[PDB]
Design an enzyme around this catalytic site. Structure first.
Site, PDB file in Angstrom:
ATOM      1  N   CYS A  23       0.843  -1.190   0.000  1.00  0.00           N
ATOM      2  CA  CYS A  23       0.000   0.000   0.000  1.00  0.00           C
ATOM      3  C   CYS A  23       0.880   1.243   0.000  1.00  0.00           C
ATOM      4  CB  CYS A  23      -0.945   0.013   1.207  1.00  0.00           C
ATOM      5  SG  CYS A  23      -1.939   1.519   1.341  1.00  0.00           S
ATOM      6  N   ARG A  35       0.095   4.449   2.996  1.00  0.00           N
ATOM      7  CA  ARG A  35       0.213   4.229   4.433  1.00  0.00           C
ATOM      8  C   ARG A  35       0.640   5.447   5.249  1.00  0.00           C
ATOM      9  NH1 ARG A  35       4.080  -0.607   4.778  1.00  0.00           N
ATOM     10  NH2 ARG A  35       4.485  -0.187   2.557  1.00  0.00           N
ATOM     11  N   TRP A  76      -9.240   6.586  -0.364  1.00  0.00           N
ATOM     12  CA  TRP A  76      -9.539   7.358  -1.555  1.00  0.00           C
ATOM     13  C   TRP A  76      -8.582   6.900  -2.643  1.00  0.00           C
ATOM     14  CZ3 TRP A  76      -7.979   9.927   3.016  1.00  0.00           C
ATOM     15  CH2 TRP A  76      -6.616  10.247   3.061  1.00  0.00           C
ATOM     16  N   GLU A  83      -5.236   4.292 -10.470  1.00  0.00           N
ATOM     17  CA  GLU A  83      -6.052   3.114 -10.195  1.00  0.00           C
ATOM     18  C   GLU A  83      -7.297   3.107 -11.055  1.00  0.00           C
ATOM     19  OE1 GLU A  83      -5.997   1.725  -5.900  1.00  0.00           O
ATOM     20  OE2 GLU A  83      -5.920   3.922  -5.658  1.00  0.00           O
TER      21      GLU A  83
HETATM   22  C1  HEM Z   1      -6.254   6.428   2.098  1.00  0.00           C
HETATM   23  C2  HEM Z   1      -5.884   6.367   0.814  1.00  0.00           C
HETATM   24  C3  HEM Z   1      -5.275   5.078   0.195  1.00  0.00           C
HETATM   25  C4  HEM Z   1      -4.602   5.064  -0.956  1.00  0.00           C
HETATM   26  C5  HEM Z   1      -4.295   6.293  -1.847  1.00  0.00           C
HETATM   27  C6  HEM Z   1      -4.190   3.703  -1.222  1.00  0.00           C
HETATM   28  C7  HEM Z   1      -3.462   3.267  -2.311  1.00  0.00           C
HETATM   29  C8  HEM Z   1      -3.249   1.943  -2.597  1.00  0.00           C
HETATM   30  C9  HEM Z   1      -2.883   1.405  -3.891  1.00  0.00           C
HETATM   31  C10 HEM Z   1      -2.669   2.270  -5.156  1.00  0.00           C
HETATM   32  C11 HEM Z   1      -2.757   0.080  -3.777  1.00  0.00           C
HETATM   33  C12 HEM Z   1      -2.378  -0.877  -4.924  1.00  0.00           C
HETATM   34  C13 HEM Z   1      -3.452  -1.960  -5.019  1.00  0.00           C
HETATM   35  C14 HEM Z   1      -3.841  -2.234  -6.442  1.00  0.00           C
HETATM   36  O1  HEM Z   1      -3.155  -1.707  -7.349  1.00  0.00           O
HETATM   37  O2  HEM Z   1      -4.834  -2.981  -6.653  1.00  0.00           O
HETATM   38  C15 HEM Z   1      -3.054  -0.283  -2.393  1.00  0.00           C
HETATM   39  C16 HEM Z   1      -3.036  -1.548  -1.824  1.00  0.00           C
HETATM   40  C17 HEM Z   1      -3.465  -1.908  -0.556  1.00  0.00           C
HETATM   41  N1  HEM Z   1      -3.997  -1.059   0.401  1.00  0.00           N
HETATM   42 FE1  HEM Z   1      -3.962   0.988   0.252  1.00  0.00          FE
HETATM   43  N2  HEM Z   1      -4.627   2.897  -0.195  1.00  0.00           N
HETATM   44  C18 HEM Z   1      -5.320   3.710   0.698  1.00  0.00           C
HETATM   45  C19 HEM Z   1      -5.940   3.273   1.843  1.00  0.00           C
HETATM   46  C20 HEM Z   1      -5.895   2.030   2.428  1.00  0.00           C
HETATM   47  C21 HEM Z   1      -6.573   1.650   3.663  1.00  0.00           C
HETATM   48  C22 HEM Z   1      -7.491   2.596   4.502  1.00  0.00           C
HETATM   49  C23 HEM Z   1      -6.270   0.360   3.893  1.00  0.00           C
HETATM   50  C24 HEM Z   1      -6.679  -0.568   5.062  1.00  0.00           C
HETATM   51  C25 HEM Z   1      -7.185  -0.121   6.223  1.00  0.00           C
HETATM   52  C26 HEM Z   1      -5.386  -0.094   2.829  1.00  0.00           C
HETATM   53  C27 HEM Z   1      -4.849  -1.351   2.699  1.00  0.00           C
HETATM   54  C28 HEM Z   1      -4.280  -1.814   1.525  1.00  0.00           C
HETATM   55  C29 HEM Z   1      -3.900  -3.180   1.257  1.00  0.00           C
HETATM   56  C30 HEM Z   1      -4.044  -4.362   2.238  1.00  0.00           C
HETATM   57  C31 HEM Z   1      -3.408  -3.236   0.022  1.00  0.00           C
HETATM   58  C32 HEM Z   1      -2.890  -4.517  -0.664  1.00  0.00           C
HETATM   59  C33 HEM Z   1      -4.010  -4.978  -1.589  1.00  0.00           C
HETATM   60  C34 HEM Z   1      -3.660  -6.292  -2.241  1.00  0.00           C
HETATM   61  O3  HEM Z   1      -2.700  -6.972  -1.781  1.00  0.00           O
HETATM   62  O4  HEM Z   1      -4.362  -6.655  -3.223  1.00  0.00           O
HETATM   63  N3  HEM Z   1      -5.194   0.939   1.948  1.00  0.00           N
HETATM   64  N4  HEM Z   1      -3.346   0.888  -1.719  1.00  0.00           N
HETATM   65  C1  LIG Z   2      -8.557   1.096   0.465  1.00  0.00           C
HETATM   66  C2  LIG Z   2      -7.912   1.257  -0.890  1.00  0.00           C
HETATM   67  C3  LIG Z   2      -7.741   2.522  -1.454  1.00  0.00           C
HETATM   68  C4  LIG Z   2      -7.147   2.632  -2.714  1.00  0.00           C
HETATM   69  N1  LIG Z   2      -6.961   3.833  -3.326  1.00  0.00           N
HETATM   70  N2  LIG Z   2      -6.751   1.522  -3.359  1.00  0.00           N
HETATM   71  C5  LIG Z   2      -6.899   0.292  -2.838  1.00  0.00           C
HETATM   72  C6  LIG Z   2      -6.356  -0.868  -3.631  1.00  0.00           C
HETATM   73  C7  LIG Z   2      -7.350  -1.959  -3.947  1.00  0.00           C
HETATM   74  C8  LIG Z   2      -8.396  -1.363  -4.843  1.00  0.00           C
HETATM   75  C9  LIG Z   2      -9.649  -1.090  -4.322  1.00  0.00           C
HETATM   76  C10 LIG Z   2     -10.639  -0.549  -5.128  1.00  0.00           C
HETATM   77  F1  LIG Z   2     -11.858  -0.292  -4.608  1.00  0.00           F
HETATM   78  C11 LIG Z   2     -10.367  -0.276  -6.464  1.00  0.00           C
HETATM   79  C12 LIG Z   2      -9.104  -0.549  -6.982  1.00  0.00           C
HETATM   80  C13 LIG Z   2      -8.818  -0.255  -8.434  1.00  0.00           C
HETATM   81  C14 LIG Z   2      -7.542  -0.975  -8.859  1.00  0.00           C
HETATM   82  C15 LIG Z   2      -7.813  -2.085  -9.878  1.00  0.00           C
HETATM   83  C16 LIG Z   2      -8.127  -3.430  -9.224  1.00  0.00           C
HETATM   84  C17 LIG Z   2      -7.612  -4.483 -10.200  1.00  0.00           C
HETATM   85  F2  LIG Z   2      -6.990  -5.521  -9.553  1.00  0.00           F
HETATM   86  C18 LIG Z   2      -6.622  -3.755 -11.106  1.00  0.00           C
HETATM   87  N3  LIG Z   2      -6.632  -2.327 -10.733  1.00  0.00           N
HETATM   88  C19 LIG Z   2      -5.380  -1.993 -10.036  1.00  0.00           C
HETATM   89  C20 LIG Z   2      -8.114  -1.095  -6.173  1.00  0.00           C
HETATM   90  C21 LIG Z   2      -7.476   0.135  -1.579  1.00  0.00           C
END
Ligand code: HEM
Ligand SMILES: Cc1cc(N)nc(CCc2cc(F)cc(CC[C@@H]3C[C@H](F)CN3C)c2)c1
Ligand code: HEM
Ligand SMILES: Cc1cc(N)nc(CCc2cc(F)cc(CC[C@@H]3C[C@H](F)CN3C)c2)c1
Ligand SMILES: C[C@H](O)[C@H](O)[C@H]1CNc2nc(N)[nH]c(=O)c2N1
Ligand SMILES: C[C@H](O)[C@H](O)[C@H]1CNc2nc(N)[nH]c(=O)c2N1
Ligand SMILES: [Zn+2]
Lengths: 413, 408
Positions: B107, B110, B279, B284
């Site tokens: 993520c 964070r 958000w 994404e």
């Molecule tokens: C607040 C703004 C946040 C932003 C801008 C953000 C951004 C991202 C992005 C860009 C990814 C890449 C995942 C993908 O490409 O599919 C990611 C993954 C992830 N985020 Fe964040 N995130 C946010 C909030 C959170 C929150 C609130 C949580 C949990 C309480 C969280 C937990 C995770 C986890 C566990 C992943 C790994 C997902 C996976 O392994 O498929 N994120 N985040």
């Molecule tokens: C809490 C949180 C915030 C944030 N900003 N992002 C995430 C990451 C997970 C995710 C959630 C989501 F609601 C839509 C996408 C769009 C991405 C898509 C999913 C697919 F796997 C290929 N794209 C990357 C990815 C989590």
């Protein structure tokens, strides 16, 4: 380890099965508890260490020519064994040298160009004794590989390491690179990545033109002697002026680049033998020039000046002015190389070829070591097919390896 | 042993000591790295996991070894004895949920980890209850466009037969429809789930942006369909600041990204339903949720309207269209006052977060493969940042899709 590992492509759902990893040799850097896959870099071999390394390579070579267990195989093993016993080293046959060099490329997990691996021209320079002779070999390499713009991959292999005190080294990191000059005011002229090597050259006697695109001299060390300077004949250095198919002002940036990427600071390991000077060259992927060489902040850093001439809003990052300018720079680099008939590959074609190559290797060899962190291009990653491709990374031998910079280890005479 | 990570752009070296506190596997070995592989209890197992978590919680509030700490350890010990499990205190639940985000190596968001609103839904018993909690979550997190991070935690797994699951992968997603003539109307990532909803009685409007219903499973029962009230679903029409034709593409997206298919692990307890939201980073939506070949796949049309030469890849028409789509997405959310971050700002913040974590915590587990944005990688600061990846707990984990395990 388990006998089969699966990798998935998440765009296409294709699942491949790797067994080649069972032959992996040295370490990756990772452990069960930590992954070091984004770490860039995570007194010779005794008789006892050399025997098994040579046998492993010889077995592999004879297996590749479908002669495993033959009379010639056993005779080669015994001849190598005798030679290690009485001289603490051995010499590769020309066939083995060629096979070894091609497979070090085939095994280079960080290289996206490997679909070409079997077309490598190998130049055997193990008879070289002096830096003048190294210069002659390197010139011939450059002229052959450049081929008037129709580039051909090549490697020149200088004598292997003996006791570590008689190493052949190319002190240049690449055969063709531009000088960088640190100014008293803190600014840099030319290529900022190359300031340290440039200062070394000046100390060794180079008279610098002090320009923006000054080709650096070769700094060549033979048989452990102090290195010597040689100017590459400028007619051997093919260069491409960068212009843009739409923006006429782009030529006014005064940019150009050289056509031949040629790595000269890596170590080729074959059968436990160490070739510390093995310059090799192919052709460029556009993003190596257009994204990194020009747009890295610690490099030529022209994004700002391109964006200004494009009249983008540079006050908010969310306008993505940087991304817009980066694309136009890479468009110009591809267009300039194609217009001058100098071989270049865009990142879309290269990565599609690499996927085709990887699938063939999985099916024909049982695997393909690949370093995703390096294979995915530095722009537009997720619209190339490697982004969605799971990869396994592991170290096969023969291999190219990093080695210390020679100015940190050389004992000056 | 201490490990160093170098940024090759700034030459900053950080020293990682935190990796010594990890215990779960990465998937790599000394001989094979699996850093780009997406997916690599009992009483007797539980108490050590509980002890470790209680220990690090009472260490985080500077009351390690306190009377409160000792008594908590004994309380948890007795409770696993007599019930084969235990219940977290409210404070522990909040601590574990924030730290699961903090420890999420993939993520880039964070830097916000300690500003997470934690909704305790462990008293929930039915899918109607889950629906209520999820609507409250959506309404709170949306906040009229001033988006707020939040997580809602449903009851923990007990015997594996009474799991709570949100069957949706995200709370808000558009439906995808297998068109008889071959292609796909809507979102192609969700074609399977869309068909399971239709199979469960959902009446599809068969548009391009049809919000899927919630499919909710409580206590292991058959899942039930619910429609999120539309006034709760904030959407953004996508337009472009310079291309007046872009709005004619008809595109929009939802403002709230909300992951609902992961498992939250805290102190050996498993929370199989824990939807969490934040958000968007603009890529994404604009790189993956529009331009993936297995997604909306609108690059060709945009490049078409841009009159780009699309006969050879080396014109980089795909790259040009990709940038403009992402410009429009950022412009649209910002113009509608809906929280969004561009990948330049996000990665800047993450590098700052990393420096913060190394100083106060001794490291920061980070997965370069996922942290680096899907476009313009090397002009972001994370591209040149070496990262160490390792598994700390509390954590978010993947779990199987419920429709592969559930018995109806
Ligand atoms: C607040 C703004 C946040 C932003 C801008 C953000 C951004 C991202 C992005 C860009 C990814 C890449 C995942 C993908 O490409 O599919 C990611 C993954 C992830 N985020 Fe964040 N995130 C946010 C909030 C959170 C929150 C609130 C949580 C949990 C309480 C969280 C937990 C995770 C986890 C566990 C992943 C790994 C997902 C996976 O392994 O498929 N994120 N985040
Ligand atoms: C809490 C949180 C915030 C944030 N900003 N992002 C995430 C990451 C997970 C995710 C959630 C989501 F609601 C839509 C996408 C769009 C991405 C898509 C999913 C697919 F796997 C290929 N794209 C990357 C990815 C989590
Ligand atoms: C023929 C065309 C070739 C292309 C298009 C190509 C492409 C690339 C690219 C894009 C990289 C990453 C570059 C970087 O970011 O530093 C790379 C790395 C590498 N290539 Fe190739 N390459 C080619 C030929 C070769 C040849 C002929 C060899 C050796 C025989 C080779 C061996 C390597 C090695 C060892 C690396 C790793 C470099 C490192 O770790 O610093 N490549 N290649
Ligand atoms: C044989 C071969 C062909 C090819 N196409 N590439 C390579 C890779 C080695 C390399 C050589 C070079 F002459 C320039 C660069 C790029 C300049 C720098 C290096 C740094 F990683 C940031 N920039 C990308 C990289 C080798
Ligand atoms: C093969 C590779 O692991 C897979 O495509 C990953 C790569 N990096 C990613 N990075 C992000 N942010 N999101 C993703 O879905 C992926 N997918
Ligand atoms: C920190 C990170 O490992 C470093 O920036 C790597 C990332 N991937 C790369 N990939 C390529 N092709 N070339 C590089 O120089 C790098 N640099
Ligand atoms: Zn690894």
């Amino acid at each position: 380890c388990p006998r089969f590992l699966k990798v998935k492509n998440w765009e296409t759902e294709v699942v491949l099965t790797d067994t080649l990893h069972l032959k992996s040799t040295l370490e990756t850097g990772c452990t069960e508890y930590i992954c070091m896959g984004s770490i860039m870099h995570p007194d010779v071999a005794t008789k006892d260490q050399l025997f098994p390394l040579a046998k492993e390579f010889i077995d592999q070579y004879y297996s590749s020519i479908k002669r495993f267990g033959s009379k010639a195989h056993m005779e080669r093993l015994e001849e190598v064994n005798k030679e290690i016993d009485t001289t603490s080293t051995y010499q590769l046959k020309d066939t083995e040298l060629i096979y070894g060099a091609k497979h070090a490329w085939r095994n280079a997990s960080r290289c996206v160009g490997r679909i070409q691996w079997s077309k490598l021209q190998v130049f055997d320079a193990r008879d070289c004794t002096t830096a003048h002779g190294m210069f002659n070999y390197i010139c011939n390499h450059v002229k052959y590989a450049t081929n008037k713009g129709n580039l051909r991959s090549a490697i020149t292999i200088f004598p292997q390491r003996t006791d570590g005190k008689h190493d052949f080294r190319v002190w240049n990191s690449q055969l063709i690179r531009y000088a960088g000059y640190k100014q008293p005011d803190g600014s840099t002229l030319g290529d900022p990545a190359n300031v340290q090597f440039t200062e070394i050259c000046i100390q060794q006697g180079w008279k610098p033109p002090r320009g923006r695109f000054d080709v650096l001299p070769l700094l060549l060390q033979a048989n452990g002697n102090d290195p010597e300077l040689f100017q590459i004949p400028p007619e051997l250095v093919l260069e491409v002026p960068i212009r843009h198919p739409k923006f006429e002002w782009f030529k006014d940036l005064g940019l150009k680049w050289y056509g031949l990427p040629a790595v000269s600071n890596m170590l080729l390991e074959i059968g436990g033998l160490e070739f510390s000077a093995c310059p090799f060259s192919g052709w460029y992927m556009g993003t190596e020039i257009g994204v990194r060489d020009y747009c890295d902040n610690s490099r030529y850093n022209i994004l700002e000046e391109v964006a200004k001439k494009m009249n983008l809003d540079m006050r908010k990052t969310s306008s993505l002015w940087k991304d817009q300018a980066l694309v136009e720079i890479n468009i110009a680099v591809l267009y300039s190389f194609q217009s001058d008939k100098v071989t270049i590959v865009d990142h879309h074609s290269a990565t599609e070829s690499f996927i085709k190559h990887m699938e063939n290797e999985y099916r024909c060899r049982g695997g393909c070591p690949a370093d995703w962190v390096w294979i995915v291009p530095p722009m537009s990653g997720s619209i190339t097919p490697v982004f969605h491709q799971e990869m396994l990374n592991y170290r096969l031998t023969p291999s190219f390896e990093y080695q210390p910079d020679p100015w940190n280890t050389h004992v000056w005479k």
